[PDB]
Design a protein around this nucleic acid. Sequence first.
RNA 1: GCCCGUCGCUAGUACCGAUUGAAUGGCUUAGUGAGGCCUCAGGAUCUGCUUAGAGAAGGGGGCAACUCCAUCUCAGAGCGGA
RNA 2: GGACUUUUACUUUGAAAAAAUUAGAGUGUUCAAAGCAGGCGUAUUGCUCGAAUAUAUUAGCAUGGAAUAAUAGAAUAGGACG
RNA 3: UAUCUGGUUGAUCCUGCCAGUAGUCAUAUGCUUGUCUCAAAGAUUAAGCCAUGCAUGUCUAAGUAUAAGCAAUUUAUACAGUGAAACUGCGAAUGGCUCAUUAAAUCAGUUAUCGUUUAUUUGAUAGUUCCUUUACUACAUGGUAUAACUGUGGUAAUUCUAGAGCUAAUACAUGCUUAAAAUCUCGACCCUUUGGAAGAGAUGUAUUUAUUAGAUAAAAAAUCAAUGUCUUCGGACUCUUUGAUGAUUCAUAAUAACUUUUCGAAUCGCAUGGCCUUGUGCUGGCGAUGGUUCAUUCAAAUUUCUGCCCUAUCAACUUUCGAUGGUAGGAUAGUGGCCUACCAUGGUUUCAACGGGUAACGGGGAAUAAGGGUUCGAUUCCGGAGAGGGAGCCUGAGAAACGGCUACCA
Lengths: 260, 167, 188, 155, 131
Amino acid sequence: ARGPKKHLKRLAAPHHWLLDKLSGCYAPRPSAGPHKLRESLPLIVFLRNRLKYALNGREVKAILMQRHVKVDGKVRTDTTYPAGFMDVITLDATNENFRLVYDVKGRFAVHRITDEEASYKLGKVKKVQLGKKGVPYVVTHDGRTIRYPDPNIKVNDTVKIDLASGKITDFIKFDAGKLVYVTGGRNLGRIGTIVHKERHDGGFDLVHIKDSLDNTFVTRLNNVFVIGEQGKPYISLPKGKGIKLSIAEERDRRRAQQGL
Amino acid sequence: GFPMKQGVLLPTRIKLLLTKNVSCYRPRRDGERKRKSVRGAIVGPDLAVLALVIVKKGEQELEGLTDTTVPKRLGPKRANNIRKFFGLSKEDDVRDFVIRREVTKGEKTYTKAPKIQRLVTPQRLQRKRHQRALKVRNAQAQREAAAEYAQLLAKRLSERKAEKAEI
Amino acid sequence: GISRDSRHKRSATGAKRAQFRKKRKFELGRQPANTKIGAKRIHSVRTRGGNKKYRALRIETGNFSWASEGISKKTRIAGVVYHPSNNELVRTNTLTKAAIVQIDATPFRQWFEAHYGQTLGKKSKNAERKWAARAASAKIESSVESQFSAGRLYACISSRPGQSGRCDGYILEGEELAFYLRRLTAKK
Amino acid sequence: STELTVQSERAFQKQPHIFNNPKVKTSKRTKRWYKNAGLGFKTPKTAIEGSYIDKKCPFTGLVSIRGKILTGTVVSTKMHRTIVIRRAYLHYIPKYNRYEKRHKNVPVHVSPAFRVQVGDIVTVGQCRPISKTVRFNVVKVSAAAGKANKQFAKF
Amino acid sequence: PRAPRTYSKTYSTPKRPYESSRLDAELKLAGEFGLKNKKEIYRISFQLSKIRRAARDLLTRDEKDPKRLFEGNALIRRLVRVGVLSEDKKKLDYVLALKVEDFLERRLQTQVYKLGLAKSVHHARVLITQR
RNA sequence: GCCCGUCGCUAGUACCGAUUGAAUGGCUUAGUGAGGCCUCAGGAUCUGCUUAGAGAAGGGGGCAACUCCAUCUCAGAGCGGA
RNA sequence: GGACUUUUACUUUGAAAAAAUUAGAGUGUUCAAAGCAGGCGUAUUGCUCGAAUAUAUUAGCAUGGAAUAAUAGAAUAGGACG
RNA sequence: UAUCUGGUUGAUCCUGCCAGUAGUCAUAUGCUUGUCUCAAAGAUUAAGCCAUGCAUGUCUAAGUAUAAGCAAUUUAUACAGUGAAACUGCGAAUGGCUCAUUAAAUCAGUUAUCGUUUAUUUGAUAGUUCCUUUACUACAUGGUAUAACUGUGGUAAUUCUAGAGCUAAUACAUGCUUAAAAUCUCGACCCUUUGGAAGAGAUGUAUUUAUUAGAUAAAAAAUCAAUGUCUUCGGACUCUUUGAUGAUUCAUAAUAACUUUUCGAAUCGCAUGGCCUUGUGCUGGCGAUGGUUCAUUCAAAUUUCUGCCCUAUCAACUUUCGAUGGUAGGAUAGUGGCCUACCAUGGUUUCAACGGGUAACGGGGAAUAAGGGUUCGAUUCCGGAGAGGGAGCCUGAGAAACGGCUACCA
């Protein structure tokens, strides 16, 4: 249709942003970046709609232009910046450090971390290819292009990044029995160690997963992100740790703690 | 009121396709062409005005022409243009020969000179120096990282020889 | 202009196809170069997303590779003498891929006489060591050397002249050369 | 289909960039290249033995099998190096809660490695646009000849 | 270009137009409770009729079906919170029973009377509506 | 008792029909073909690189012979560009 | 990793799956159509529950079934395994 | 939320339609109309025609200020505050509107690019640019030609512009540069062995061609042509390097070349200091804009499977002037009869082709509540198409754009 779309009609905007059906008309269209449109999160929805640090999007823009926010180490002035998974939100004033990881509902959750944890990133390798001048390279889910990796790193493995520097430090391979975070589908936001990989050549490898409640589910290799060992992630999970309570269970819990 | 146009011939009006960077037409948008009327370049009775230019002066002074003289409103702004209006050789410092313009702010006559561009300056030399410096630094950087991967691969090969020695 | 869509043109079933939408810029084609021999004239064409194509119209010199000798020189293209698509390209000496032309031979002569010390058709100590080291490698081939006598070498174009502005190609050799040999005389 | 003459075109049929040096006296004349489709598809003997050319061959040509893998019944082999196959099916209609016999004739390339005949059930693999109608390539002959010789003569 | 500000209606309307008996009963409810519209009855009888529907559909489900459990019990607790469903009869077979009168009797209209403050449902009306 | 058709009057609808009747729309033969785009030529002017003269400038460093780089100016000849 | 496999329909579970819309949970917009809010204290420098679930069939993928109903095979043995 | 009722008879039971009844995010219209909230709205007919206004522009300490601009002051005799105009850059290819065409088209659910283009954002990425190569080529930085402006003007008339005179660049056109190493060729000589060598040239990246490497299906041998590293001088060669995909002639690499030569910084802003051999020597901080290639993101272009309303008073259709396929080429960003040439005779059809109709844009959907259905969707989201009708095209990463141009018709 004659060229690049510049607007986003608030109604087509991804639901996991939790934007109200009315009041307004448009949404922030995530800038070009390290993350796909429908799995990012603009700074404005985070600062304003997720953190209540703002009301007018204009005020968000000001706040931001004041260099307060910084993502993964760089200041960032983009109002509708495509911040997404594993990214490190950093407020030097207020002394707050955030990491963007999924709920169990499927949304991005407000998660407060250490100042120490906020100095290294996790990154699922999406591809690893030989480069020009014979220099091999790995590229992870967030478009991070790191050269000279370990000759034992394949696709779908996961990786620990410096943030303050570029070098990959530690890495975990995609084996059976690995604490895995589901990043897509409606089984997303859950966590559960991996069971077994349905192969299928040239047509979507299915991944069999099991959480710490002996609940099982499948997905596809795409939505699967490796994050560690049994009971031993490499990042700070949030309240619930991807176990998915049924409607009746949730009903029971939220009306269990009820004594005013 | 239609304008002539050098190189059409015909002592008559013709309608041509006019483009960027060509007479009797200034565009209003990128690559905007327009078909406009234009008078020929051959003189005739239909001409209201004839733009002529003196090549040689006769034996008589013409009133508001030969008798009088107007100034070239501006002066040399680039470095070597200044160095060539007078011809100075890249030596005599250009910052004195820049024409300065007086202008009386009522009871405060002022002195304003251009802003010499293409001038070789300290800060330019500093930036240049930084270019070459940074370039070489990253060169050796990438070289040493290359040596590093060379080592890792080498003593990985060594661990493959060691492992193949185990079994 | 020239559209390369498939939206015109009958369905395989047969039916006439309606006119959905108008001509789009991206489905465009452009005119053939129809490139010929002699004097360098090449026009750059602006394509999609920048990227110039080079369109040779008249070309005199090209880069030709002697496949089995490991070398490649730059010679003057003498003339088209065969073409599998259209005979009209031969009568017109129009330059195009897969066209069979005759090149100059003399730089290839100079190289071979300077490399083997043997000379086609029909002193320095180090160079003697080399020319002696070689041989059992100077057999050429009947058809290639016979080709060398007349001083014109049957070559096959492999570059796209109306595309790259280059008229490169290889020398004919073996089964291929035999084919175009039989073919090129049996129609004369 | 093809058959005979191999070099029966105005141009010279040769596999691209498969140099066979004249000087180097070989006893096979011509150097042959080939690969494997994948997905389980055994590259037939007649493809590596043979001396055809077909750039639209999955096993020796310049195409790649990827996407859909279908099967069908050969209805047409009248053209050259290409066939038409009828894929039948049944269509569910809700209001009546019943089915109806439908079909589609898919155009598909067939390499001179195989030897097809009308009736042979065949397995094809989707490739790139080969022709005006062709997006599939015959990749396995599941049938045979429908017990042809089993209609022989008296005694 | 904005979102649809959704809506719906809250009343149905009798199929037969002039069934004298139903007119009698409807009238009785009106005068007894101090309603100005037959609509005020229709409304209720529609609301109720949706409940009952949701009820029937659950009753066909298998006992201890997750949806029957969660939603059925949710509906039940809902019909209790107001004052229509008794704590005695409290397992969605009475919600298949029920009647309009039980809904009618729970209005502020009805309560601001039934224990004094009014002496008539009409004085209840006039009081309520007058701030 | 009921009842069928020709025939007669008022209203309405549709059919057949000289006019080889008319109107709109989509396709379309043949002929004529504007226009931008491509291409062979064109050269109002306006410079370009190469060859050499006539007057000064700046020195690779010398007692005389010796000798490079940048710039500008007019009789005059080759190789191409806009 | 090497070597080959008669083809189907049916049914199950699952994945892949925008929102709004519908069905529907929670929250007293004073009620209500709605909205996705809100609720709590130290109401002088916080506390905190959410923003569910379901349907989403035909075709394509994936997985379990082996009744029903088709299909192919060893008779001029040109058969089966070794 | 599974209901009927009035009308053929003298009366009866039927058949059967007419009429009654109820709703419609369903239009209109009529009579009446007081309060709160919510707020659809020139779609239907005429994608009919339109007066006037407005709806697209845009500047950071950081490309270009000698406004004969304003402000003055706080140093500022190159400039520096602030800033009209003009240049340059990006944007105007989104938005908004309409439903005219469109019936295997669009759309949808599902796919593919081992079939391509992509501004941007994001992460990566660059020591080679000169030349018989000591009496040297600006790099302490090479060339003009222009607007604005001044001034002279033309027409009834426009966002019309002519002749003259000035002047900028991150515009235009040029054009130097930096380490070590090694690999290939040639090769002066010296000297016969089995042969080894001073020093001359080439080797950034991109582009075009040819060639080679890119192993791995479990394990061993002889010979010919070349010819490598170490001699324990008969000879051995031992450890030997391997990425990815289901799949490649893939990524990546080497050889011989090729090119009216792509790129490799003649740019800007704040600070202004280190270190002496005291040369305006040599260094040195922060980030701005740019710059080739790869990745990323936003895209786009095509593309597999299956699914559309009425119609037989449409049964055969398709190849004129491509219809279905093979070869080669051309053209494209690229796949392909997309086009050309040669060649063949193919392609669809009662499982309904082809043709006609549609008051037909497709979908999410909507109305109607026993179920199965019936009916509808121009219209707040998504996809497509158009800008009075047609074609053509410039600019550009992206348009066959119309609040762009060109031509024809109205």
